[PDB]
């Protein structure tokens, strides 16, 4: 049950802003598949990122939603593959939101080497307005 | 096995096989669809039942008649199955390829709870 621990560790490290642990748990050359909403001028939607590209998107999001946290609700593991359902919880200027995240991660030697994630942004925006 | 149920589900969606869909999904299943699937009568975040889900799926099928969903990775622990799928098609001459992530609870060979989200923004970027 090591890969499951890696992924649990990841979301805790994101919540705490723990860069050292994030960089331990994600390989520098990991293949990160972010959703189309995270696409920009340099990465069109569908283009994979590396670790530091992912951590860059995370930091941008955190600037807008400084109290946003992810809690793991369900986790399943088979071999080196871990899938998770999380709930992202925060407030936008005093109005609380609650958004589902679904993730799939490949772990090798206790490091994430591939990751897919999508968030239910439309539901979050419905809650805020 | 629960893995077999979920593999059967996506095959049944691809084939348009309503009979098998209704066998594999309990009528009272709790279906958590993304906010894009919300409307005037069912606000974003409100769970649906099977027939509500199959209603949204029929609209989606009618809109992208050549779309297929292929299970790429499947993980199982107990009664919980997660899948990564790729939805593929060609919409009016433009090919598209979009990730779907799903999580399903299976009991007695039927889906009783389901969460799904699809990377719609990437799909729309590929078409326009």
Author numbering:
A (entry chain B): 6 to 134
B (entry chain A): 7 to 134
Manuscript text:
Indanomycin is an antibiotic from the pyrroloketo­indane family which is known to act as an effective ionophoric agent against Gram-positive bacteria. IdmH is a homodimer, with the individual protomers consisting of an α+β barrel.
To improve crystallization, a number of variants were produced to reduce the surface entropy or to truncate predicted surface loops. The asymmetric unit comprises one copy of the IdmH-Δ99–107 dimer with the entire polypeptide chain successfully modelled into density, except for the N- and C-terminal regions. Both the selenomethionine-labelled protein structure and the isomorphous native structure of IdmH-Δ99–107 were modelled independently, giving almost identical structures that superpose with an r.m.s.d. of 0.12 Å over 257 amino acids. The remainder of the structural description will focus on the unlabelled native protein as this should best represent the natural form of the enzyme. With this structure in hand, the crystal structure of wild-type IdmH was determined by molecular replacement using a single subunit of IdmH-Δ99–107 as a search model.
